[PDB]
Amino acid sequence: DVPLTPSQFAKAKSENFDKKVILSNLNKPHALLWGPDNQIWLTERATGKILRVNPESGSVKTVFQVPEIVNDADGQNGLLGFAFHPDFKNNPYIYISGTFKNPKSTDKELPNQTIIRRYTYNKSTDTLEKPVDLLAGLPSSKDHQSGRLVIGPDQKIYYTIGDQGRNQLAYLFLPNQAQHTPTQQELNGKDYHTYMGKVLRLNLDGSIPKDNPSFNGVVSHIYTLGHRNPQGLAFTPNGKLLQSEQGPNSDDEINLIVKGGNYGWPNVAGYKDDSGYAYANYSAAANKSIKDLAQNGVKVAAGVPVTKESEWTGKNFVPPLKTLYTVQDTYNYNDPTCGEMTYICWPTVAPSSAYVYKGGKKAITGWENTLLVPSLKRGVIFRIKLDPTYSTTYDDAVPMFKSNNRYRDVIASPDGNVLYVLTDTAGNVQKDDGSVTNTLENPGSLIKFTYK
Amino acid sequence: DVPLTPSQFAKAKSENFDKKVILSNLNKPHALLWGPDNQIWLTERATGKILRVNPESGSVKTVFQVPEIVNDADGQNGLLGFAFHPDFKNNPYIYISGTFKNPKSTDKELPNQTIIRRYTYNKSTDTLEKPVDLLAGLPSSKDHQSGRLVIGPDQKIYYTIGDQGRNQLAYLFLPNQAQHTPTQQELNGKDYHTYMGKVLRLNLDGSIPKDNPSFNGVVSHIYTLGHRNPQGLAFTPNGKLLQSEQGPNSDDEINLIVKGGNYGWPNVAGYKDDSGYAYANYSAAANKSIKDLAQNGVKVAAGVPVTKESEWTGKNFVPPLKTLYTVQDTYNYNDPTCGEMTYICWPTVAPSSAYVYKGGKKAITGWENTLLVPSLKRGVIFRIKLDPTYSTTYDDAVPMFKSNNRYRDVIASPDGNVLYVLTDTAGNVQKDDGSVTNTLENPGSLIKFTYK
Numbered sequence A, B: 001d002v003p004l005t006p007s008q009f010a011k012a013k014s015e016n017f018d019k020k021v022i023l024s025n026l027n028k029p030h031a032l033l034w035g036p037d038n039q040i041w042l043t044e045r046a047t048g049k050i051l052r053v054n055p056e057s058g059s060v061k062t063v064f065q066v067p068e069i070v071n072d073a074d075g076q077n078g079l080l081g082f083a084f085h086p087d088f089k090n091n092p093y094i095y096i097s098g099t100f101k102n103p104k105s106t107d108k109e110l111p112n113q114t115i116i117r118r119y120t121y122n123k124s125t126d127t128l129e130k131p132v133d134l135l136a137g138l139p140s141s142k143d144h145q146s147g148r149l150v151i152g153p154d155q156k157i158y159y160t161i162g163d164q165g166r167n168q169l170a171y172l173f174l175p176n177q178a179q180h181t182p183t184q185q186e187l188n189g190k191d192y193h194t195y196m197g198k199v200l201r202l203n204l205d206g207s208i209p210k211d212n213p214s215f216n217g218v219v220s221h222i223y224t225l226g227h228r229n230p231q232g233l234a235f236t237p238n239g240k241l242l243q244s245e246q247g248p249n250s251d252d253e254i255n256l257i258v259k260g261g262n263y264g265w266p267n268v269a270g271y272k273d274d275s276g277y278a279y280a281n282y283s284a285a286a287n288k289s290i291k292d293l294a295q296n297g298v299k300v301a302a303g304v305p306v307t308k309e310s311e312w313t314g315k316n317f318v319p320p321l322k323t324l325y326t327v328q329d330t331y332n333y334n335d336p337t338c339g340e341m342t343y344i345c346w347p348t349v350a351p352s353s354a355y356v357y358k359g360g361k362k363a364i365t366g367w368e369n370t371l372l373v374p375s376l377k378r379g380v381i382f383r384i385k386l387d388p389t390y391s392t393t394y395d396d397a398v399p400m401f402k403s404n405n406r407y408r409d410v411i412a413s414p415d416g417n418v419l420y421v422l423t424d425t426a427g428n429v430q431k432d433d434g435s436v437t438n439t440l441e442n443p444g445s446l447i448k449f450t451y452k
């Protein structure tokens, strides 16, 4: 899609909802879920706390704090995945992922791993216990961790794991592994370094499903590959798997996740269109003193090999359902009209989640078959319509709830007339006038929006 | 997708197949089908003949000649749709569409109508009889008739009817009706003027299915709207409906046809990307002497209103699964290489059909879940892989069978190792070196390609 302008974002104020801030100054609140007890459960990524919030009183209880979660103040690591077992009344399990020290690493510079872990909820003591590591030794870094964890209708865990930030910023010269897949020898050794930029599908005990797709002759936990930072993952009522993903300077994506698909990253951003992005592989640069011009690969410094999207030899490439947004090669990624933090005007929205709106007895008019996609950078939540079979999007991503907030997650109440949203505690967001602020209106908040 | 170069088309010679001409004396052969008698049935668009060819021996019989078919030598009209009833042994019906004079028209700029008609096949005399008009008074013109007629798994007729060529060439100043839908009064009066640029879904008697979608508050025969020239329509084994469509100077499309969808034409070519196309509505130019610069709306003469794709207020807009091809605004539609016909270098392929390859006992390796899309202008048949659920394309459209021929239709044998192709009698095609020829290697032929 074509970017919206600052004025188009500014007017999306959702006057048809009442806003009530339930809590603020949460410590990097990250995921929220409607609990089996009809309370709001949310995670604090930085502290590893799992909080249960009564939405009417805002009363909070720290149900559990995941011990030894590792979080860096300037990082996206910490407590990430969070899901309830779908049959919680008979299987009172919570599944998480998080960043933990990796004792198998003596290197003090990539010191952590990601672990997918199950806890058991004890209703008598109202806490979590009996941890079981389901899958350990997963990559970890400060960037592009993703970590959305959902349980599918097939009773498998689906887990997004980002590309770790390779090929940008602090990890510029590390080779991006989104396209790489494990050999059998690596699987035998539990060497999961290729589990970057993937959607994994795991049995509930963490084992590899025998019916997972094959990539390069090997079935692993990988379900799909070629992702950058896939923070959103949600099943539709008819069993399809929708996803949102953050692109680089362009081409955030809404994807339909299909078994064995290749979502193209880093070779392809968005559509395979050679439009506004090319793959500049800094790990293959002539030397490490080269600078990233940060022009999305369209213009690069000498010495970094660039591959057009159309030059990539890909297999099973799956294009996005929708890009937020796609631009042409003439696009100026250094456009100063937004101010001197030019990225704010980049044709992206930084989607942080993806939520399938299920309606209910108070369903919001017109919202059938919608996907809600919060935006960190634009301070909106997008509503994306699909057809009733969830086979295509209809029309464009409609912005809602414009504010100076980095929206991090969204759910709806069972009745469907109330949305609950998390916001980041700190960061930059685009103001109504298009410029950047790091003054967030509701830092680290749980907000409810009630349809009038 | 990004256009292939002439060199990339030239190399797609399919040396792994043996070519044999079965019939070489056909006049404007248009559709071909594998019939319920395991013979190949094909139509001749201008003569109205329906021929049956024995695939083993190549003997051919004219089964029927549809009387009073109207065809213009400079036109795409004539005998178009052609399908068998799916339970032919018990319901020996053939369904056609064709151009016939409209005695309710009293001028000869648009003197004809399209009629969807059923015939009963008489096996004892090997002919068609008992014509029944199922839907008459449909639009007709010389351009963009489409007319693919298939019977879906739901036992309904699906019929593509193009946009009649409005807003280009001889029909430049007629308002394109692809977005227009009938009022209840028009519909009740059998006024089908809005049945342009549509996929229709009809009951087998021509009536309106009670579960057809609604557009603008009216349930009509329209199933989808917003099409330009949808020449290909084919159901997949799991009941999805794939389509190919000719775009203007760009953005031929492979579409997934979803009930009630709006495929965007003429406001949107391909993706809603504002890239390489804009909608210049010549019918809205006050000055009817204005010239069409034929730069895809990106460059226009003074006096024609232009709407960007992103400026359209659309409902239920469904983007294509694949474009052949999309280019940026900097693209030069007058780039020399094709001579006085710079339009053969246009980033399109002119798809003429869409065929779901079903494999079989001798299925071609790697062709699982492919859609075969013949190209008129490039003299290739594209192979487009989809995932096993036919939810997305995988990778790119792979050209095959490069020759100086305008490929008009394709089917495969039941075992899957033979492809049968029709070629146009006349027209332009791109040569290996990228230039244009109107010397076709196999004018008006039925050809078979057998995997080696």
Ligand SMILES: O=C(O)c1cc(C(=O)O)c(-c2[nH]c(C(=O)O)cc2C(=O)O)c(C(=O)O)n1
Pocket: A076, A229, A231, A246, A247, A248, A249, A250, A343, A344, A346, A348, A349, A350, A351, A352, A376, A377, A427, A428
């Ligand atoms: O403008 C853009 O494209 C853009 C903007 C942001 C933004 O939010 O400011 C981000 C981002 N996402 C997270 C996150 O926690 O998900 C953190 C950051 C960050 O830059 O600090 C990204 C990206 O990571 O791709 N792209």
Ligand SMILES: O=C(O)c1cc(C(=O)O)c(-c2[nH]c(C(=O)O)cc2C(=O)O)c(C(=O)O)n1
Pocket: B076, B229, B231, B246, B247, B248, B249, B250, B343, B344, B346, B348, B349, B350, B351, B352, B376, B377, B428
């Ligand atoms: O280069 C392009 O875009 C292009 C090329 C052709 C071509 O075949 O040469 C056509 C076309 N299609 C048919 C048909 O029978 O379907 C007839 C013609 C014609 O030009 O006479 C179209 C189009 O009608 O969009 N576009």
Ligand SMILES: [Ca+2]
Pocket: A246, A247, A248, A249, A250, A348, A350
């Ligand atoms: Ca980004």
Ligand SMILES: [Ca+2]
Pocket: A226, A253, A263, A264, A265, A268, A269, A270, A319, A320
């Ligand atoms: Ca992608």
Ligand SMILES: [Ca+2]
Pocket: A251, A268, A269, A270, A271, A272, A273, A274, A275, A277, A309
């Ligand atoms: Ca791209």
Ligand SMILES: [Ca+2]
Pocket: B246, B247, B248, B249, B250, B348, B350
């Ligand atoms: Ca065309």
Ligand SMILES: [Ca+2]
Pocket: B226, B253, B263, B264, B265, B268, B269, B270, B319, B320
């Ligand atoms: Ca379209």
Ligand SMILES: [Ca+2]
Pocket: B251, B268, B269, B270, B271, B272, B273, B274, B275, B277, B309
């Ligand atoms: Ca377009």
Ligand SMILES: [Li+]
Pocket: A180, A193, A194
């Ligand atoms: Li590796």
Ligand SMILES: [Li+]
Pocket: B180, B193, B194
């Ligand atoms: Li009308």
